[PDB]
Amino acid sequence: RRLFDNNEREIARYYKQVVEPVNRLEAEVEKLPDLAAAYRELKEKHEKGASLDELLPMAFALTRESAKRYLGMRHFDVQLIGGAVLHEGKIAEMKTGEGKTLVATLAVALNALTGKGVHVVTVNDYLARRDAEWMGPVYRGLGLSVGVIQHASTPAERRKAYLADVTYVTNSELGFDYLRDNMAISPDQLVLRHDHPLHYAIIDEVDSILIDEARTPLIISGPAEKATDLYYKMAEIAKKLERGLPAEPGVRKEPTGDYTVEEKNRSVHLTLQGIAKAEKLLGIEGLFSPENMELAHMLIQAIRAKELYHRDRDYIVQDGQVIIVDEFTGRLMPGRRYGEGLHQAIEAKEGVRIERENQTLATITYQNFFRLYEKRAGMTGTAKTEEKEFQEIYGMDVVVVPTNRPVIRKDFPDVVYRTEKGKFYAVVEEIAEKYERGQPVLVGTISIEKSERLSQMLKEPRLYLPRLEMRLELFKKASQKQQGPEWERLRKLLERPAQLKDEDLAPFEGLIPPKGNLRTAWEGLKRAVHTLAVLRQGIPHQVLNAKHHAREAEIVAQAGRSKTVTIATNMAGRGTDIKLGGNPEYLAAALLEKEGFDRYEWKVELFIKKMVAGKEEEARALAQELGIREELLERIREIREECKQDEERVRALGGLFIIGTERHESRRIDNQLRGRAGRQGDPGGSRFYVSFDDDLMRLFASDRVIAMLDRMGFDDSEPIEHPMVTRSIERAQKRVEDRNFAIRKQLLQFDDVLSRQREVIYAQRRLILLGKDEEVKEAAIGMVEETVASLAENFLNPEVHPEDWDLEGLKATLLDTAPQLQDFPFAELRALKAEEAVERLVEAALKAYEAREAELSPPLMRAVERFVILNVVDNAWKEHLHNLDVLRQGIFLRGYGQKDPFQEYKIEATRLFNEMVAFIKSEVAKFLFRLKVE
Amino acid sequence: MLGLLRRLFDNNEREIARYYKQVVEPVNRLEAEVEKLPDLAAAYRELKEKHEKGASLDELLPMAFALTRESAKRYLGMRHFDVQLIGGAVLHEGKIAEMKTGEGKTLVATLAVALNALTGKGVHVVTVNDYLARRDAEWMGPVYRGLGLSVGVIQHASTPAERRKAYLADVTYVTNSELGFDYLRDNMAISPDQLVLRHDHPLHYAIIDEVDSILIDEARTPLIISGPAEKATDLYYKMAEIAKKLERGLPAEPGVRKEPTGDYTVEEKNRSVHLTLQGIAKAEKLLGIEGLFSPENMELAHMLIQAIRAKELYHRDRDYIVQDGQVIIVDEFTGRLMPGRRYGEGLHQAIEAKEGVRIERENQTLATITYQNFFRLYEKRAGMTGTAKTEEKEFQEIYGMDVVVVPTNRPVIRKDFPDVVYRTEKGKFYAVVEEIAEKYERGQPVLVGTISIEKSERLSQMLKEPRLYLPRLEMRLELFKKASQKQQGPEWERLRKLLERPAQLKDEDLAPFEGLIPPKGNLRTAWEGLKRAVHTLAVLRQGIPHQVLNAKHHAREAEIVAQAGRSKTVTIATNMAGRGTDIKLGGNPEYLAAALLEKEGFDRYEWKVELFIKKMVAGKEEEARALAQELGIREELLERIREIREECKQDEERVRALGGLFIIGTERHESRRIDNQLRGRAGRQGDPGGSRFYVSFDDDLMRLFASDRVIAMLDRMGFDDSEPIEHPMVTRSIERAQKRVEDRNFAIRKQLLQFDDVLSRQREVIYAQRRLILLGKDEEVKEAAIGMVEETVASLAENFLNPEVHPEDWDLEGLKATLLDTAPQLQDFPFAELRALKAEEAVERLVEAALKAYEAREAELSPPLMRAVERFVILNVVDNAWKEHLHNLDVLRQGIFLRGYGQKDPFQEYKIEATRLFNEMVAFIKSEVAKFLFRLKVE
């Protein structure tokens, strides 16, 4: 191995470049009165230009020593490796719990120098909190601030949290905060830093977070973008509103409507009568321009739907709803809506019912998200299995870090049973054995109904009756071929279930042939009789359907004690190391009702950890500063010395011994249940159970196998050992694995399209929120530039030299820009063609802005820009994310052959966007010109 | 589940029932009537009429089937079991019938073969090798002939003659490769007396005997025929020099014709019009006669024309940038080099000969067919095998055949054990030997399967060289030792020295110290181990008679195989070695035929010989004697047969209670099906039997196809080198590795068909365009021929005779372009309607004139010779252009595969360019056929 792979020659170089050096410098470093000072010094050294790589040894050594002084755990050489891998922005694969947490600090420190920020994510809040406080002293001991985010945390706490040197958050939490930040209104809503703000991440359970959890995106559904009431009331007004004629010689627009020349696209409802008529309905003319920007929208769109969109020509309506039509192919547009929200408007005009449900407001995929960090890395006991994915999607390579102590755990094969019912009976049987022997046990299920059902079998013994009986009638059928007196005697003893204790069967053993066939059935019947008795005798459970993360964890920490039997539901006690007799936990429990934990954590635990360790010297100083008199010092020696002896009984009784009830949807998710045992060189074993009925085999096994298996007619009660069976099992788990792979591969495909789309709109939103006035005003003017340009230019730019179009270029610019200039445009415009038209207008436009920078002092004018732009963009955006959702779960129908659905989607997607931007820029301009500050 | 539900639910149950209802029961109802028929031949000839009267082949099935069964019953002596009648229907339904062992399959063929032979269009039955083709054919001959059907059989050695005769028979037995190449050959034939397949149908219906092997485990590569280089370097470079020695000429002046040898295309047109007879005459003076030039030197004209085309109408450093490599075309599309793209018509090497760039001198594709697209050609395909349901979706999708799982005759009872994993391949084998010895000593027959010959022999050595089993013995000895000396007494020291010597240890040496054996596990386990090894050795030394069968002599081994079912036998079948010979628990008719070989031969008397051998064993004193009379069978032969037979009946009885065959797979194959067959060799018809595979982290599967991560994790796991391995990670990795392979091969063939699916449409056309001309439908030959003149001329003139700039534009270049491609001329009136009346009445006024000249040529050389020229010209043009395409494509596949521009799959680019070259190629063909038909010289 060492000769062969990457994961060996590599490990050696890590020892050479990291381990040995950090060890060589432990001497010097331990003779430092202040590690904080040393760290503060390193920050300068690095800020002096010293690479983060070169400083690694020092930093690492210092963190180890700080860990040694304020926490009391010297980083094992291999943990120093995990650290480097982490810093190297890779995945460090490491087997059990605790090893992982501490390894984080190593890299966490080295990179916290930059003070740009450091994020450490875990599967749940509990652990975030835990790991944070648990490792707090090592961090503080070097001068590092501990930032922790829990779900309950408020926008405030969150911001403080990320502002700390190191932050502990769950992936979903850190996730949505990213999305929220890009949905923020006031800068005092944003939580992440602005400086970096997703600098470096260290994912605690990568494979779980970036794989078994990255099969779905992060979605925030909002209420319906404004309800049916306003949409239908906007249709009625459209018809009540009479129709108008265009501009005559010198005399202006007729009524409310100024059509687009049926080929142009602009709906110019401008006669103030029209404006006034509409507002008279539910608002004031004032409110209409300022603040009712969304209403104008709805008004504008309503008239646009009626007037510039021919119903049965541009879209054929059916009992379903409005279905757009393509002038492209001369067909219906399958599941395609209309931009700016004009869709429901065209529905409101057609009296077609509109939706009243949620919709996407912001969406990100865990993949693309973590892809944003300046540097990502992570850890887990199971990851090499998916290295090629990690490497390819997140860029991280996987490094298989050496264990501290050789694994000794005895992972047994599987045990297959035809019926799930039979599989469980088998499981109880295992359990009872281990209980009676005194070896602890930890069963893993995949559901709560299953966890409890297991419970009930163990608690009421009346459930094991069917087994007993089934083993009884089996013994029976082969048995009565034997007729004598003695036989008839046990024939009635066996006509009653309970009489059957072990003593009832002992006397007739004389009738048992050594020969296989029958003794086999007799040993079977005897076994069951015994099992029942054990059951009845009572087996203490402790089920852990992961509901109260904190409560169960404590219960988990003690699962390593001799007669314990824990039913962890689904990764229930995920994160709490199970040692063979839990010591400091119920030690703290004693110290709870005396000298609390919170405050004195620096000493309490270092005392609990010192006593158990047996350091009369370090234990006493801590005892002095504390209120610990002999009575407490003794019950600790008593609990401790009792546990050492339980360890001895257990640590020689076998070990933990995990029992998986059924296999998971991935070898890694179940290689972890086995992982819970034989932690650090400890003894231990594992064994999985399977049934053709349990999950894996029916949901993901082929419909042909789930059929062949049955017809194979396997012996319902006893174990199954057959090629076809073990073939199909091992293959089913792989189908699923692969299915999920696909399921997520496609999710990223889709969200790659969106990325470039988010990219822009997300940043265009921030330039305006960052508030760079200079950059705000510049950009704002830029939108006036393009709108006006292409607007007039639409037809003011013909190859036909002077003659062609002039009045439509006047009104189009007149609407989008309240101001006016009108006698000299004709001069240079109707006479001198296309080049000196576009640039003679830009200049005039600026002049008006400047004058407006006088009306409302310059401060308010940009204030309007901020209000206007955001309101326009984010109002248009939400309608896109909606339009897209409806496009994905629409165009997926078997469209035209070979052109992948995707190609069609990508094509249309990019289209809608560009169009959307058009609408944005254009609308920003207009509204900046026709708004009313007051 | 199992019983009622599945029967309420799916396919392979509800279907079987319907088969029973519509096929089985009816055919049984009619056995009475049919058996009272003096001649089944007559009945069949009658059915042929009934069908020819319009009776669907479906409706006649029961009758036909019943008749085939009875003929089978009379002339062969095996009534088709009800399930076999099903297999037959499924076959006829053009599906895959899945059936477990050997013989059931062969006879099931006859059923459908008969029903469809009515049409007399032909029937093909293919198998994995010649031997079986031959075998199945003669073996089932009587059933066939008994109904009036001709038995056609093709072996590799068969000559083009026999082959043709063979295919002309009602039914033909051929191997897939054989039948495959004959397809390609027929499309490379020169004279019609070289073609072997019928012309009538000629790939009518096929019944693939071992479908999964033929269409999957054998369909990963194509069928290809590479020929010599399309004409060598000499002629290509000599055609370059002539091009430059040949001076340049000026076009047509007022009324005075072309100047020297060259008439350029207007630099934008495309035609090279070398027409001054001086030019023609100068070139021919080099190596031929002016005559030979037009007639017969069609390929030379080509090279001459192309050479001048390369020099004059293709700007070197503008259309293609040359490098130290070779000429690399340039695209005016993207303004870049054209990666690995050659030039049409073979103009490529011409442009290389001009640039003095070295030309190839190697083979190239002349005709390629993938087994997939090939069998896809049959009017109706079907097939059979014990293992196929596994790949149904493939069969369904590619060949359209569904898979039907036909019930077994007698319930399977074979005991397929799990696998046994060992860390070292060496340890795995030690283990294997151990198994064999046991089975030997007990007397249960054994059939070991390997995957190579080295392994087969190696195993062999180990058995005949008991020298090789000592390590085991010794290793089991020192293991017993280490846990043992914790016990010190007198008795222990006694066996401590008996064990300080290897041989003393016979079973007798260990029997006395059994008194020191604790019933308790730990040690007795090591003692039973030591005991076992000691026993094994003695058995080995006693000798274990092998019989290795590395599939070399198909016929010789087969006989050896047929007897593997006898009590003390131990056969080492290499890789599907004895594939096809049912290993009964005592081989009867085989060495019965062996006895009758050196007396009354098989061939001729096959109708009686075998029906006699099958009757005697069956025990039919009545039917046996009549056959004996017609034969030269006196008591002596009749007895050794009763002796052989009665000896086998009782060996059948011993093996059948000693366990059964029991197959031992040495390592797992590259597919569950390929190894479910090795297990399949045992427990044939309801028979007893067992199986077990062995595995090692070192054997093939695990290193070639197991992940580089697994092949590493496994090792570090530090497994106990000598004893069995039972671990999740292990069994996980195994089952999963076999799947990687399976899937890999799947891909490997999916892409083969992808490329060759592109080619299919391409072969499709040119292959048939070639046949219309060879089928010689004069009517269709002349029509088609005229059609090429039509398009050439049309688009030619039309290229610039159809402008938007009304009369004025281009006229002289339209004259010479058509003047070269058409020796004849008309020149003062074209200007009239052409230079004056635009584009519609230009193209159609030329077609008409063209025909007139042809008609006049149909007089130079009478109408019969005119078509003869067409035949000679067209084929010569197409197939000369084709070979250059197949070349250009090869070079395109193993060229464009480089990591081209990103996401656009290499394929998409290939598909695109592929279709491009073709279209272009067609252009060149049509155009060139026209020309050559106009400028040739019959004499």
Curated annotation (Swiss-Prot), chain A:
Quaternary structure (record): Part of the essential Sec protein translocation apparatus which comprises SecA, SecYEG and auxiliary proteins SecDF. Other proteins may also be involved. Monomer and homodimer.
Gene Ontology biological process terms, A to Z: intracellular protein transmembrane transport; protein import; protein targeting; protein transport by the Sec complex
Membrane topology reported for the UniProt record: Peripheral membrane protein
Gene3D superfamilies listed in its UniProt record: Helical scaffold and wing domains of SecA, P-loop containing nucleotide triphosphate hydrolases, SecA, preprotein cross-linking domain
Protein purpose: Part of the Sec protein translocase complex. Interacts with the SecYEG preprotein conducting channel. Has a central role in coupling the hydrolysis of ATP to the transfer of proteins into and across the cell membrane, serving as an ATP-driven molecular motor driving the stepwise translocation of polypeptide chains across the membrane.
GO cellular component, one term: cytosol
EC number: 7.4.2.8
NCBIfam families: secA
Domain of life, per lineage: Bacteria
Protein's recorded name: Protein translocase subunit SecA
A single MF term (Gene Ontology): protein-exporting ATPase activity
Originating organism: Thermus thermophilus (strain ATCC 27634 / DSM 579 / HB8)
Annotated ATP binding sites: Q79, G97, E98, G99, K100, T101, D577
PROSITE patterns (alphabetical): SECA (PS01312), SECA_MOTOR_DEAD (PS51196)
Keywords attached to this entry: ATP-binding, Cell inner membrane, Cell membrane, Cytoplasm, Membrane, Nucleotide-binding, Protein transport, Translocase, Translocation, Transport
Residues spanning the membrane: none
Keyword Cell membrane in record: yes
